[PDB]
Write a protein that binds this ligand. Structure first.
Ligand SMILES: [Zn+2]
Ligand SMILES: [Zn+2]
Ligand SMILES: [Zn+2]
Lengths: 605, 69, 347
């Protein structure tokens, strides 16, 4: 609305500056953005309060940035905070008061809660509201009557239409409450599972659980925790908390195996009580209460096998007290989201290390699952030592002239290969590998295109890993890498970042990436976040290097791809050249070698 | 013989792009007088402005458009 | 048994609301090289802190007692090693300390071996010199090959004054060792306490009723130089790869030229020293009388402090007991700490 002679939005006509603004560490913008002095004496209280009421945008070292959202406001009401309570404390923290536009915005979002609640009973879904009249106006659109099946008033809703109705309810300004009173529920039988005292719960984990379990009723939503932060333990703890039949869904069979191990590792539950409903393996799922499977299995669009149909019908008919969803960034997919309509679950908890995707469907998680129940501050976890200090870097590999000549000439998809394969990027990786290998550092090499992966790994005489590599060959390489001292690096394709349980490594070199996507970048970095046998956070023991070809599309993709990491606070140090690479003996030391590779690169046709 | 113009020196990647520009006739004119060296070429003084503009454009073609994102 | 989350959110933000003195003394500094020295017990690393402050103490030790000599012992892995024998050169000791900063700092120390190694050295010292040991104890556990009480009795008999400084520890053996020998055992309260304790140890030890006095033969040579720019010179190397000496001190008996004084004869075993070095200790013989405090203005018409000719900015003032001159707290402190004389009394 108001803009100065400069592009900055100004709010002098919108809010005043309080008398003790120097003591107050926060500002409230009329557009919903919020800033917080991380160095302020009350930062601790303000951080908790802003994580409770707002959505974090950036959390750098000196000033954090947040924005208000209906979902974040609903979460605030979900922990019992009244409009006056958040307003009074926000005004007290705000050094420039609260703009009336935000105050009235908060009013609407606060009063629009508690009015309508969705609950399921006897495999039937009922929409309840305390006020009886609200239903009459809320039903004024036939989409609800067609969705509706043919005090505390309620009506039953057609299961298949719940997704459409729930999304409408948001833009209809009447969100559905999803608190599940697992404590006062005798209809769904409890399960004999508890967290064994061997399990250790960290403060951030405890915070996320406390925020999810704001009362005796579990709240649905998404918890964002790094893979190294023990997201699996939180999920297992939530199941142990709900004490009712629960369904865990992983994005891969490897994850399903990981979950089984974690459940046995952290809970009193026995192996027979856990089943891994999977096409590749059978555990007689109907024989036990805890089930584990994948979106590909349940979400399967084609004809089901007769045996798998037996379990699925049993799964369909049973009601799940808790539905744990891992790597929910995939959930908004057209097929994966169908799982939410197929399975009947009282409360659904989503977990993921990278709640980002290149499509505008991430926001669906707010209605498909719920608001962000928690989102760890990765810098705080490093400061607390829970995550390894990773000195990220971007090596600006200069492209070779004969490569650039072709790269600039070829505008088709073939340039992705040419910018991925050049002597300088190759020599740089070989040099960094040799250096870290002679430094006795475990190194993981990452790539996308198999052609470059092969030609690099073969020229480096190192074992690569990719899709068609059988599980036996694949794991045998990991065991050698982990244990054999003579091997210290592995060349992994997307298989390593998509979904896997790779052994932790001190160093990671990414020579190729699918694009400027944030998701894959943070998934790759996640592999090195694991704490080592004797490291310390100030040691800067972990490393992460992105190899990019200067003056190429890789530069655009790389900067675009790092957005999520810089938002979390990571410093991508640019490396123009590495001292010693001029004298170290490396491949492509003569133009004929470059020409030979370039010729074969062109032969790719 | 002797030739009027302007010399430009840059890394050989840009030097290849410069050779590519007139080889592809992107600017329609053989602005390179001669191949001086892997990092050096001599060019007509009147075209250096659009040449510099094309180099600037090439960076944007190979750089992310931050634009308050 | 319900879980901790049944109660509710933490709501952390809701908490916010709107005597005779022994002039000549020989001292050995004992320092632990044990594992606890690597501990960051203070703000800096304990090894770094102790060594850094010891370089200051070593220099101040000679600065307040030139005729004295100091030695240092490092004790680790049940062993005690003489880092530097008794000498008059602080720079040599300090050079060893700077080197010792990189010591292995591994194993357990041995007080018994530290003291016995010192005693095996200090037993041959003359009777007039105050034999002393300063122990910087770090790890309260210390291995010993024999009953320390016999060694303690031997120390009393050997008249070796032992005083222990314990870091974060109040040890029994150190308590009895100090108090039985007549020395003192102190423990580091904080960095200021550590600085204060070492500063206090720089003072000469007060003579015990069991201590006896003695005379000592001493040499007072004169520095001699070439007549003019390498003319009538006497080519020679220093006694301290010794370089050539253009000029230097001599000894009537050694007839060997020396570059640095005061030092013990390398031959005769006699101390060579310059007369000012002795006077540097006479403040111990002339202790300055404390000036009476007059913190109030007491209608003193002298707005300017006599020592610094500055108007007294605070209610802290002192007047001399003899010359009755008026001095501010900074002047009185500087006088008693550094000048050791009353400016008006000199008149
Ligand atoms: Zn002599
Ligand atoms: Zn004064
Ligand atoms: Zn006086």
């Amino acid at each position: 609305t108001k803009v100065d002679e400069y592009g900055a939005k100004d709010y002098r006509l919108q809010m005043p500056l309080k008398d003790d603004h120097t003591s107050r560490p926060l500002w409230v913008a009329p557009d919903g953005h919020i800033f917080l002095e991380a160095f302020s004496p009350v930062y601790k209280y303000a951080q908790d309060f802003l994580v409770a009421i707002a959505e974090p945008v950036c959390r750098p070292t000196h000033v954090h940035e947040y924005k208000l959202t209906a979902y974040s406001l609903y979460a605030a009401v979900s922990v019992g905070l009244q409009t006056s309570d958040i307003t009074e404390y926000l005004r007290k923290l705000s050094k420039t008061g609260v703009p009336d536009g935000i105050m009235q915005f908060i009013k609407l979002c606060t009063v629009s809660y508690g009015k309508v609640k969705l609950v399921l009973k006897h495999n039937r879904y009922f929409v309840e509201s305390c006020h009886p009249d609200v239903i009459q106006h809320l039903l004024q659109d036939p989409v609800i009557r067609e969705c509706r099946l043919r005090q505390t008033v309620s009506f039953e809703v057609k299961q298949e239409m719940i997704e459409e109705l729930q999304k409408r309810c948001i833009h209809l300004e009447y969100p559905l409450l999803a608190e599940y009173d697992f404590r006062n529920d005798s209809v769904n039988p409890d399960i004999n599972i508890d967290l064994k005292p061997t399990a250790v719960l960290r403060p951030y984990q405890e915070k996320s659980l406390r925020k999810m379990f704001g009362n005796g009723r579990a709240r649905s939503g998404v918890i964002v925790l790094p893979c190294g932060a023990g997201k699996s333990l939180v999920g297992v703890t939530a199941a142990c908390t709900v004490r009712k039949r629960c369904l865990v869904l992983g994005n891969s069979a490897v994850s399903v195996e990981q979950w089984k191990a974690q459940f046995k590792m952290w809970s009193t539950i026995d192996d027979s009580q856990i089943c891994r409903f999977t096409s590749d393996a059978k555990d007689k799922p109907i024989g036990c209460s805890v089930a584990i499977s994948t979106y590909s299995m349940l979400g399967h669009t084609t004809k089901r096998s007769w045996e798998a149909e037996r379990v699925m019908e049993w799964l369909k008919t049973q009601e799940w007290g808790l539905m744990i969803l891992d790597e929910v960034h995939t959930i908004p997919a057209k097929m994966f989201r169908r799982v939410l309509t197929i399975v009947q679950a009282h409360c659904k908890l989503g977990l993921t290390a990278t709640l980002v995707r290149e499509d505008d469907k991430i926001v669906d998680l707010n209605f498909l699952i719920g608001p962000k129940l928690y989102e760890a501050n990765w810098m705080e976890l490093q400061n607390n030592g829970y995550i390894a200090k990773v000195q990220c870097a971007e090596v600006w590999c200069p492209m070779s002239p004969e490569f650039y000549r072709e790269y600039v000439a070829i505008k088709t998809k073939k340039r992705i290969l040419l910018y991925t394969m050049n002597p300088n990027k190759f020599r740089a990786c070989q040099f960094l590998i040799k250096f870290h290998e002679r430094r006795n550092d475990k190194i993981i090499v990452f790539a996308d295109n198999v052609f470059a992966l092969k030609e690099y790994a073969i020229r480096l005489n190192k074992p690569y890993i990719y899709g068609p590599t059988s599980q036996g060959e694949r794991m045998q390489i990991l065991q050698n890498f982990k244990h054999n001292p003579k091997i210290n690096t592995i060349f992994i394709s997307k298989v390593g970042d998509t979904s896997f349980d790779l052994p932790e490594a001190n160093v990671l070199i990414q020579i190729s990436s699918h694009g400027g996507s944030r998701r894959q970048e943070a998934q790759r970095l996640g592999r090195v976040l694991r704490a080592k046998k004797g490291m310390v956070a100030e040691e800067y023991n972990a490393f992460f290097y992105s190899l990019v070809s200067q003056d190429t599309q890789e530069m655009a993709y790389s900067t675009k791809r790092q957005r999520f990491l810089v938002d979390q606070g990571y410093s991508f140090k640019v490396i123009t050249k590495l001292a010693g690479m001029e004298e170290e003996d490396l491949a492509f030391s003569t133009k004929e070698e470059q020409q030979q590779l370039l010729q074969k690169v062109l032969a790719a046709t | 013989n002797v030739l009027k113009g302007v010399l430009i020196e840059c890394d050989p990647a840009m030097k290849q792009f410069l050779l590519y520009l007139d080889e592809s006739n992107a600017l329609g004119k053989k602005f390179i007088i001669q191949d001086i060296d892997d990092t050096h070429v001599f060019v007509i003084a009147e075209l250096v402005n659009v040449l510099q503009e094309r180099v600037g454009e090439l960076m944007d073609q190979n750089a992310f458009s931050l634009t308050q994102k | 048994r319900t879980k901790r989350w049944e109660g509710g959110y933490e709501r952390t933000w809701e908490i916010l609301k709107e005597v005779r003195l022994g002039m000549m003394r020989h001292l050995y500094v004992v320092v632990d090289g044990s594992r606890t020295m690597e501990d960051q017990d203070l703000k800096p690393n304990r090894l770094t802190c102790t060594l850094k402050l010891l370089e200051y103490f070593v220099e101040e030790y000679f600065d307040q007692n030139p005729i004295s000599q100091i030695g240092i012992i490092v004790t680790k892995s049940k062993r005690a090693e003489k880092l530097t024998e008794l000498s008059g050169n602080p720079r040599k000791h300090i050079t060893s300390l700077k080197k010792a900063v990189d010591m292995t700092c591994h194993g357990e120390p041995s007080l018994y071996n530290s003291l016995s190694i010192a005693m095996q050295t200090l037993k041959h010292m003359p009777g007039h010199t105050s034999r002393e040991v300063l122990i910087i104890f770090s790890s309260l556990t210390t291995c010993d090959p024999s009953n320390i009480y016999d060694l303690i009795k031997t120390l009393k008999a050997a008249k070796i004054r032992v005083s222990v400084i314990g870091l974060s520890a109040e040890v029994r053996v150190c308590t009895v060792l100090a108090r039985e020998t007549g020395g003192t055992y102190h423990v580091i309260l904080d960095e200021s306490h550590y600085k204060e304790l070492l500063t206090h140890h720089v003072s000469p030890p007060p003579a015990s009723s069991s201590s006896e006095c003695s005379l000592i033969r001493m040499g007072f040579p004169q520095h001699t130089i070439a007549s003019l720019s390498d003319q009538d010179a006497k080519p020679s190397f220093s006694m301290a790869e010794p370089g050539l000496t253009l000029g230097g001190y001599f000894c009537p008996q050694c007839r060997a030229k020396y570059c640095e004084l005061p030092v013990e004869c390398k031959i005769c075993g006699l101390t060579l020293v310059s007369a000012p070095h002795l006077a540097r200790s006479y403040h111990h013989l002339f202790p300055l009388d404390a000036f009476q405090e007059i913190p109030l203005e007491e209608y003193n018409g002298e707005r300017f402090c006599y020592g610094c000719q500055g108007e007294l900015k605070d209610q802290h003032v002192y007047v001399c007991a003899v010359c009755q001159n008026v001095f501010c707290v900074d002047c009185d402190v500087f006088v008693h700490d550094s000048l050791h004389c009353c400016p008006g009394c000199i008149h």
